[PDB]
């Protein structure tokens, strides 16, 4: 396989035939399906860990007031009580995607059915890759989006990013509107400090190991190769002492293999995370964190899932058909994960692999 993708009407000369040697080249379409199953298992396990089904398209964010007792007296009376409330709203978007397969009559005259099945399977694989890209794009692209629901326009949010309602106060922690979960190391190479600061971005909101929150760190090999160096009380890169050992595995978080841990981070090494990025995600515990991204479908069951639709060309000389899916994304628990880019100075950048404008495959 390669980043080569043929488009246009399938013709004769795009046909595959038995050779004069007796090689049935149409028996080879199943050959790469082992890799397709391996990639599908990998993308499935990330989608199952990263996503949940959106049952309602819009969500309230509520803030509620606080009150206290007073030292009592005989003769006098207490100082009264009242409870202000502030409410903000956020949604998930919904967008439309399609693909087309088209054949000339001369292809359909001679083609083996295994060749058309090879194209249907290539389209189902490209559908999985689209849902995967949009899930990862919802986490990495730190820009705030808009969506229309029920004749009103809503904000659709990533993690905290300096936009929208500030994070609610925790036990002692309080946060201003510029607060962001898209951040940089301030160094060209990863520290132990970076895994500890990344953990603080979750724990600051009470998504903490004291609350029973489980934690996943998703990282590129290039980061995990440096993280495997870290030892209690010993200096690493950039003068950072480690507060933990990296502890190797001989285990899975969901279906993904955990290479080991550093503090409460279960570390998973994953080549789908670009080099120079760390993604920390919280699960379960006392705040009962769900998966970071919501997947929204259309409300009508006839619009849900991947669909195949009979095309506009239905007769000699040319036949076509459409594959269509519509779905979209947004974050509810804006604090329950964080992303750090390893760089010396400047802003966080969304990796071009997951930025909104860049394409439909990963």
């Amino acid at each position: 396989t390669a980043p080569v993708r043929q488009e246009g009407i399938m013709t004769q000369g795009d046909l595959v035939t038995v050779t004069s040697d007796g090689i049935d080249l149409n028996a080879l379409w199943n050959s790469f399906a082992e890799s397709i199953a391996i990639y599908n298992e990998a993308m499935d396990n990330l989608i199952q860990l990263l996503t949940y089904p959106v049952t309602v398209p819009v969500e309230p964010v509520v803030q509620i007031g606080e009150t206290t007792f007073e030292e009592a007296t005989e003769l006098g009376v207490p100082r009264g009580a009242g409870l202000p409330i502030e409410v903000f709203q956020m949604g998930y978007d919904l967008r439309h995607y399609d693909k087309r397969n088209a054949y000339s009559w001369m292809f359909l005259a001679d083609a083996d059915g295994r060749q058309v099945e090879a194209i249907h399977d290539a389209v189902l694989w490209a559908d999985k890759r689209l849902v995967f890209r949009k899930v990862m794009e919802a986490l990495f692209d730190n820009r705030t989006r808009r969506a229309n629901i029920r004749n009103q326009a809503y904000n659709v949010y990533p993690l905290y990013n300096g936009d929208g309602v500030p994070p609610p106060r925790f036990k002692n922690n309080v946060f201003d509107e510029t607060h962001s979960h898209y951040v940089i190391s301030h160094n060209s190479v990863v520290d132990s400090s970076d895994l500890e600061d990344l953990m603080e971005l979750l724990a600051e909101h009470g998504y903490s190991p004291q609350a029973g929150t489980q934690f996943l760190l998703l990282a590129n090999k290039a980061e995990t190769d440096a993280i495997r160096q870290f030892r209690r009380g010993v200096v690493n890169n950039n003068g950072a002492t480690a507060g933990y050992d990296f502890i190797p595995s001989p285990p899975t978080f969901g279906g993904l293999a955990v290479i080991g841990s550093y503090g409460f981070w279960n570390i998973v090494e994953e080549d789908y995370i670009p080099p120079g990025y760390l993604v920390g995600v919280g699960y379960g515990g006392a705040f009962n964190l769900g998966n970071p991204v919501g997947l929204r479908q259309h409300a009508n069951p006839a619009m849900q899932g991947l669909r195949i639709i009979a095309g506009n060309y239905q007769r000699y000389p040319l036949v076509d058909g459409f594959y269509a899916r519509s779905f979209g994304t947004g974050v509810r628990q804006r604090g329950g994960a964080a992303i750090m880019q390893i760089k010396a100075s400047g802003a966080y950048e969304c990796p071009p692999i997951y930025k909104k404008g860049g394409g439909f495959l990963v």
Partner: protein
């Protein structure tokens, strides 16, 4: 949640804390959810500030807001002829002083040449380090922003001035070197005597018209005890 707002905590209603009717509409952006010093006009009706009688009490026009934080217009306790409650004896909690418009202290550090101020971020024409009080007004007015002279007041002498305003949507700042600007600020202070004024403001300073309305205890509370104004 986001803000607390002043309320009566103890108000009895039989001890000379009294029902009346408003003589005027209450401004919902400027006067609702505030502690208003009040008198009565030459009719039977409550007015903000000194009426015919001088200050005779405190009033809180309690008004809700929509989920977007704007005041509900169609209320029945805030137009002329609506009935309202005025307190002489009681406690107000979540207390804050009351002030109308914005006011800016301007002072010049320069002893030669010209300085520049920004109005809503857009720069003014150059003004001398020794401009007249008449020429701070003329400078600040003279930009194509649409406010005009009608809603600024200026007073002072060359080293410093106060730029007063009735609106809330205009902000003065410094922008050039050689000048400093501070907006005035008001917050309750513990163990202080508060004073109603002929404007209807409630402040810690008695000037020439201030009539004692109460004293605070802890800053978040006011013990109301109006020393009624007299002739």
């Amino acid at each position: 949640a986001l803000k607390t707002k002043p309320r009566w905590d103890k108000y009895d209603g039989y001890v000379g804390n009294y029902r009346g009717v408003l003589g005027e509409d209450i401004d919902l952006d400027t006067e609702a959810n505030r502690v208003l010093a009040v008198g009565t006009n030459s009719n039977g009706a409550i007015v903000v500030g000194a009426g015919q009688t001088g200050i005779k009490g405190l009033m809180i026009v309690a008004v809700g807001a929509d989920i977007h934080g704007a005041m509900l217009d169609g209320g029945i306790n805030n137009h002329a002829g609506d009935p309202q409650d005025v307190g002489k004896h009681g406690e107000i909690t979540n207390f804050q002083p009351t002030v109308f418009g914005r006011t800016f202290g301007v002072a010049i550090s320069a002893t030669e040449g010209n300085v520049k101020l920004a109005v809503n971020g857009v720069d003014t024409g150059n003004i001398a380090y020794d401009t007249s009080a008449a020429n701070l007004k003329s400078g600040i007015v003279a930009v194509d922003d649409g406010f005009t002279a009608d809603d600024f007041t200026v007073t002072g002498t060359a080293p410093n001035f106060t730029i007063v305003t009735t609106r809330t949507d205009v902000t003065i700042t410094a922008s050039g070197e050689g000048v400093t600007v501070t907006e005035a600020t008001s917050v309750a202070a513990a163990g202080t005597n508060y004073y109603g004024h002929a404007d209807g403001t409630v402040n810690a300073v008695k000037g020439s018209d201030g009539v004692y309305v109460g004293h605070t205890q802890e800053a978040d509370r006011l013990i109301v005890n109006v020393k009624d104004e007299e002739d």
